[PDB]
Write an enzyme that holds these catalytic residues in place. Structure first.
Site, PDB file in Angstrom:
ATOM      1  N   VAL A  65       0.783  -1.236   0.000  1.00  0.00           N
ATOM      2  CA  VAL A  65       0.000   0.000   0.000  1.00  0.00           C
ATOM      3  C   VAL A  65       0.813   1.284   0.000  1.00  0.00           C
ATOM      4  O   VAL A  65       0.252   2.366  -0.176  1.00  0.00           O
ATOM      5  CB  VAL A  65      -1.019   0.053   1.172  1.00  0.00           C
ATOM      6  CG1 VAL A  65      -1.987  -1.121   1.071  1.00  0.00           C
ATOM      7  CG2 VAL A  65      -0.295   0.047   2.501  1.00  0.00           C
ATOM      8  N   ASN A  91      -6.216   0.181   6.806  1.00  0.00           N
ATOM      9  CA  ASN A  91      -5.749  -0.396   8.048  1.00  0.00           C
ATOM     10  C   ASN A  91      -4.283  -0.800   8.137  1.00  0.00           C
ATOM     11  O   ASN A  91      -3.702  -0.772   9.225  1.00  0.00           O
ATOM     12  CB  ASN A  91      -6.672  -1.580   8.366  1.00  0.00           C
ATOM     13  CG  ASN A  91      -6.158  -2.437   9.485  1.00  0.00           C
ATOM     14  OD1 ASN A  91      -5.517  -3.481   9.256  1.00  0.00           O
ATOM     15  ND2 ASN A  91      -6.421  -2.013  10.706  1.00  0.00           N
ATOM     16  N   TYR A 157       5.773   7.550  13.522  1.00  0.00           N
ATOM     17  CA  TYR A 157       4.453   6.949  13.709  1.00  0.00           C
ATOM     18  C   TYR A 157       3.470   7.982  14.270  1.00  0.00           C
ATOM     19  O   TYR A 157       2.322   8.085  13.817  1.00  0.00           O
ATOM     20  CB  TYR A 157       4.576   5.764  14.667  1.00  0.00           C
ATOM     21  CG  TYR A 157       3.342   4.893  14.805  1.00  0.00           C
ATOM     22  CD1 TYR A 157       3.183   3.752  14.016  1.00  0.00           C
ATOM     23  CD2 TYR A 157       2.399   5.145  15.792  1.00  0.00           C
ATOM     24  CE1 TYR A 157       2.115   2.867  14.222  1.00  0.00           C
ATOM     25  CE2 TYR A 157       1.324   4.266  16.005  1.00  0.00           C
ATOM     26  CZ  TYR A 157       1.200   3.131  15.223  1.00  0.00           C
ATOM     27  OH  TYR A 157       0.194   2.228  15.484  1.00  0.00           O
TER      28      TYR A 157
HETATM   29  N1  NAD Z   1      -1.658  -3.556  17.527  1.00  0.00           N
HETATM   30  C1  NAD Z   1      -1.674  -2.378  18.168  1.00  0.00           C
HETATM   31  O1  NAD Z   1      -1.299  -2.251  19.365  1.00  0.00           O
HETATM   32  C2  NAD Z   1      -2.172  -1.146  17.456  1.00  0.00           C
HETATM   33  C3  NAD Z   1      -2.530   0.048  18.353  1.00  0.00           C
HETATM   34  C4  NAD Z   1      -3.026   1.259  17.596  1.00  0.00           C
HETATM   35  C5  NAD Z   1      -3.122   1.227  16.185  1.00  0.00           C
HETATM   36  N2  NAD Z   1      -2.765   0.075  15.443  1.00  0.00           N
HETATM   37  C6  NAD Z   1      -2.883   0.096  13.940  1.00  0.00           C
HETATM   38  O2  NAD Z   1      -3.582  -1.078  13.448  1.00  0.00           O
HETATM   39  C7  NAD Z   1      -3.182  -1.302  11.993  1.00  0.00           C
HETATM   40  C8  NAD Z   1      -2.739  -2.710  11.775  1.00  0.00           C
HETATM   41  O3  NAD Z   1      -2.236  -3.082  13.038  1.00  0.00           O
HETATM   42  P1  NAD Z   1      -2.014  -4.558  13.528  1.00  0.00           P
HETATM   43  O4  NAD Z   1      -1.634  -4.369  14.931  1.00  0.00           O
HETATM   44  O5  NAD Z   1      -3.109  -5.481  13.105  1.00  0.00           O
HETATM   45  O6  NAD Z   1      -0.630  -5.086  12.829  1.00  0.00           O
HETATM   46  P2  NAD Z   1      -0.172  -6.493  12.204  1.00  0.00           P
HETATM   47  O7  NAD Z   1       1.301  -6.373  11.920  1.00  0.00           O
HETATM   48  O8  NAD Z   1      -0.684  -7.625  13.006  1.00  0.00           O
HETATM   49  O9  NAD Z   1      -0.993  -6.510  10.867  1.00  0.00           O
HETATM   50  C9  NAD Z   1      -0.725  -5.546   9.812  1.00  0.00           C
HETATM   51  C10 NAD Z   1      -0.823  -6.271   8.490  1.00  0.00           C
HETATM   52  O10 NAD Z   1      -0.504  -5.201   7.525  1.00  0.00           O
HETATM   53  C11 NAD Z   1       0.333  -5.783   6.547  1.00  0.00           C
HETATM   54  N3  NAD Z   1       1.169  -4.753   5.986  1.00  0.00           N
HETATM   55  C12 NAD Z   1       2.237  -4.013   6.492  1.00  0.00           C
HETATM   56  N4  NAD Z   1       2.747  -3.168   5.615  1.00  0.00           N
HETATM   57  C13 NAD Z   1       2.043  -3.302   4.484  1.00  0.00           C
HETATM   58  C14 NAD Z   1       2.129  -2.659   3.168  1.00  0.00           C
HETATM   59  N5  NAD Z   1       3.040  -1.742   2.885  1.00  0.00           N
HETATM   60  N6  NAD Z   1       1.183  -3.094   2.251  1.00  0.00           N
HETATM   61  C15 NAD Z   1       0.239  -4.021   2.473  1.00  0.00           C
HETATM   62  N7  NAD Z   1       0.121  -4.668   3.705  1.00  0.00           N
HETATM   63  C16 NAD Z   1       1.043  -4.279   4.682  1.00  0.00           C
HETATM   64  C17 NAD Z   1       1.229  -6.810   7.270  1.00  0.00           C
HETATM   65  O11 NAD Z   1       1.933  -7.686   6.452  1.00  0.00           O
HETATM   66  C18 NAD Z   1       0.278  -7.365   8.288  1.00  0.00           C
HETATM   67  O12 NAD Z   1      -0.347  -8.597   7.834  1.00  0.00           O
HETATM   68  C19 NAD Z   1      -2.029  -0.283  11.753  1.00  0.00           C
HETATM   69  O13 NAD Z   1      -2.529   0.897  11.120  1.00  0.00           O
HETATM   70  C20 NAD Z   1      -1.521   0.025  13.168  1.00  0.00           C
HETATM   71  O14 NAD Z   1      -0.734   1.186  13.213  1.00  0.00           O
HETATM   72  C21 NAD Z   1      -2.289  -1.106  16.114  1.00  0.00           C
END
Ligand code: NAD
Ligand code: NAD
Ligand code: NAD
Ligand code: NAD
Lengths: 254, 254, 254, 254
Positions: A65, A91, A157
């Site tokens: 993305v 996401n 971030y």
């Molecule tokens: N887990 C937390 O504590 C938390 C807290 C606040 C916000 N978030 C936000 O939630 C969203 C996803 O978080 P998550 O915790 O599920 O993470 P995660 O790493 O479990 O899942 C993210 C998924 O995104 C995919 N990904 C990463 N870069 C990519 C790219 N360039 N193109 C396509 N796919 C890509 C990964 O391969 C992964 O499968 C993000 O925006 C993150 O910043 C997470």
């Protein structure tokens, strides 16, 4: 289930893990048509096969993305395949090593902004015309409490997430009267695979994060965030537009 | 005048016009050493001449703050010339034609983010080590109410300004215990040369902005913003760190 | 000093201790005419003696700001004595035992609301007509970070401080175009005589407060809060209206 | 429907009209047990008979929520009748004639604060011990965008709603680790029976409100608000605690 989500075409990025995987399953549980966008091959195949097992319509797209071309391609492919795009869930995201400003390399700054912010600008720019022609569309951006506070992550971030909320408010303000809703969901601490983006996060950045972690022992599951994202995408939330909904269990309200 | 600002070294970007020009003159009247950074040569010479006519110490630097090399160079030059950097006013900025997401070109997006946000990241990354060495420093970022609301400018500007508040909070959180203060000032509508950023602003974007100006009243003078910036840079504001101070006459409180 | 404050009539409530005492002294140093309003006789005589010892003009008025009749009394005596009221600093306030909702008595609820919020409504209602006639006036309300977060005090105090910011926003919105500015200052933790409001503060409330206090160790002095209040009352802040300025060293930005 | 709401005991105040009536019906349709609290007898009878007709369990209680005794009584009655209280919706409220501070009579101030704020304090204080014993409970407060901005209503209403958001954050902070969630829903403009609280609203107050009402023509229906309140009361929102969710169609994001 939310009747308004039946047969709606929903693009979910970062669908192969954590919150994205939970979002994809939840929308499928609501009979939506899901376009799962994921960077990793094996993760993508796994979530696609799961949704197929649920007996739902799903299209898997392997894409980065942070690349405008990949984004424009999956938007075009979705439209060509289903003739509409009803919901876009921006996401996918990565962490930044909790790196404070003075320690940030050009590479880190650029990569985090590209994946966490540019990605959503590219997709929104491409899908808005399609949603406007429909007279209806919803864009849900997964931000973070790092989008409203300064010590929950590194500078890249934190800046990208603040910017993502800005993009959300911009879309809601300019296109709300034309049938488009844009909302942001701000998770706190969720059990996923994102980690801190480094096996050796900044000592200075960690000094601040660790203190904040003393405030709560609660850790949400991906489903707790997905539940809110799917609700906001339904007609049940037809009047929620532009808000940054916090889903952190109260962490930031202390 | 503020006694704590006498002989302190202050870098002011966008010093050739509007708020920046007012910031430079105000610090000069407080007997601070001013490094005036400006893209346009004639404007740079004008401000330099104004400060020297008052008998004040000023160093003029013609630079493009969106270029990391230009930024790193004026920081090095300031340090080499005066041996200290006490205050950094990231003030330079441009408007975006009130261009909404769907109408934003890659060029516009990159240009506005570079001038309005990356510029501040480059300068902060370069000056922080010097301020940490000193055990004291203040960074004041000129944001906008577009940093907290969605209809006051186009998407690029809104996103950049939200990101700039994020950068501010990040610095305040990570370096506040080491003697650094980072604050943001959010002007509403000010009489300057920034305008709308285009002779043909977006029709859709303008429809949005116009609705918001129905809430406006008075137009601030650049000095009205500079007064707050200079106060925040002084020791009188030793406990203001991380706040996004609104200086809009009340526009956003309605 | 701020030239615009010379000979201006400033009412300071809770002037006999902590922040109020520092506010009175600071305005006095700026050659303003200070009306020191205080509940306790000895404290009132103390601050009045201090200002007289400084060779400044001061009028002392003993009053309980929670009583509307007493508020009307100090506003009227000020007007009778100096023929104008330029600045009103609603600063008097008390803590609430860090008492959570379920443990709050009817008496505690009413007392805290009356002293920390109703007092500011009574005084603002009384001075507004006078200020409108003058064509200019400034009201500065001392709130607290408890006015934007939920764990920094008990329920009564948190509710009262949130209400105080609302009162500030209301006045700013309605009277801003007629020459009146209303602003709020939000301190974090300051060493004064306010204490916790009880010799036996709530166990539950304290558990939350204690964790938040552990986040930072920098404690402001009363002068640090007074410095911002006096600046906001001056013409230097002519375009700051309705904002809730945080002066907590960065505590709430984490 | 939400499975987690089946057979849950829900108290809804102001159930006889507008948003409250929509809330009562929505919960009833989810097969929750509804305790309809309303001031006016005819309105109370209408909603009670309507839900009974739908074949749902409903208990009507005629009460004035500004009176502690009435509140404590309907809480005792609910517990004695159903042995549990799972959800408390503090929804009843009245407008204030858009009356600005200088024009506010003591009667107006006292009545609005009592009905719009004290009511929620009384009910929350009474139900918290019951929810704590259950190890689970949810309080949903119907606030307003006047709880975050200053020109959307008169001073009494704005202060009361700001205070209500403060009460929400306080409960969330103090009891969030014990199974209680407290959230606020902030509607913008909804077609109900609240009106402006007067057929002759303040001229000055209206000058400001009129400008804000000129921003958007889209008006939410009571059901659009009830939809969000019910979702937040369900287990789907288990990680939403202390947030002030805006449901105004984007009005305040401009
Ligand atoms: N887990 C937390 O504590 C938390 C807290 C606040 C916000 N978030 C936000 O939630 C969203 C996803 O978080 P998550 O915790 O599920 O993470 P995660 O790493 O479990 O899942 C993210 C998924 O995104 C995919 N990904 C990463 N870069 C990519 C790219 N360039 N193109 C396509 N796919 C890509 C990964 O391969 C992964 O499968 C993000 O925006 C993150 O910043 C997470
Ligand atoms: N004027 C307003 O209404 C308003 C409202 C809110 C925020 N702001 C912010 O105030 C700051 C300056 O605003 P202004 O209104 O005085 O504008 P201005 O155009 O009058 O002055 C800005 C100065 O910055 C210089 N500049 C622009 N790009 C530059 C670059 N890349 N490198 C170096 N110098 C550059 C210009 O040449 C100009 O002299 C900006 O950050 C702007 O976004 C302005
Ligand atoms: N000290 C802190 O940590 C802190 C933090 C945030 C906000 N504040 C706010 O600062 C203001 C004053 O705080 P402080 O810490 O200097 O307290 P303080 O107790 O040192 O001083 C308050 C003064 O107000 C007077 N007072 C109390 N009730 C009064 C009444 N009903 N009428 C008239 N005078 C009355 C007292 O007698 C006292 O001299 C309050 O609004 C408080 O809530 C304090
Ligand atoms: N309608 C809007 O535009 C709007 C916008 C933002 C917030 N709100 C909030 O929504 C809530 C209800 O609003 P509404 O628009 O449905 O109003 P409404 O007048 O249609 O319904 C409110 C109901 O509350 C009842 N009520 C009033 N005072 C009471 C008391 N003391 N005890 C018991 N019942 C009482 C009334 O009799 C009425 O049936 C209020 O808290 C209001 O402030 C409304």
């Amino acid at each position: 289930s939310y009747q308004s989500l039946k047969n709606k075409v929903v693009i979910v990025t970062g669908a192969g893990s954590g919150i994205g995987r939970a979002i994809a399953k939840k929308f499928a549980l609501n009979d939506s048509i899901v376009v799962a966008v994921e960077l990793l091959e094996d993760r993508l195949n796994q979530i696609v096969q799961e949704l197929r097992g649920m007996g739902k319509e799903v299209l898997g797209v392997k894409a980065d993305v942070s690349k405008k071309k990949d984004v424009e391609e999956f938007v075009r492919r979705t439209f060509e395949t289903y003739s509409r795009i009803d919901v876009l869930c921006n996401n996918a995201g990565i962490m930044d090593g909790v790196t404070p400003v003075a320690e940030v390399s050009d590479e880190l700054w650029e990569r985090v902004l590209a994946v966490n912010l540019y990605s959503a600008f590219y997709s929104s720019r491409a899908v808005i015309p399609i949603m406007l022609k429909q007279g209806k569309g919803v864009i849900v951006n997964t931000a973070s409490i790092a989008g409203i506070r300064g010590g929950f992550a590194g500078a890249p971030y934190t800046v990208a997430k603040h910017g993502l909320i800005g993009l959300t408010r911009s879309i809601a303000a300019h296109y709300g009267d034309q049938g488009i809703r844009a909302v942001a969901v701000l998770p706190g601490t969720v059990k996923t695979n994102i980690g801190l983006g480094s096996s050796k996060p900044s000592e200075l950045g960690m000094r601040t994060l660790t203190k904040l972690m003393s405030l709560s022992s609660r850790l949400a599951e991906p489903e707790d965030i997905a539940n809110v994202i799917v609700f906001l995408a339904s007609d049940e939330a037809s009047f929620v537009n532009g808000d940054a909904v916090v889903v952190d269990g109260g962490l930031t309200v202390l």
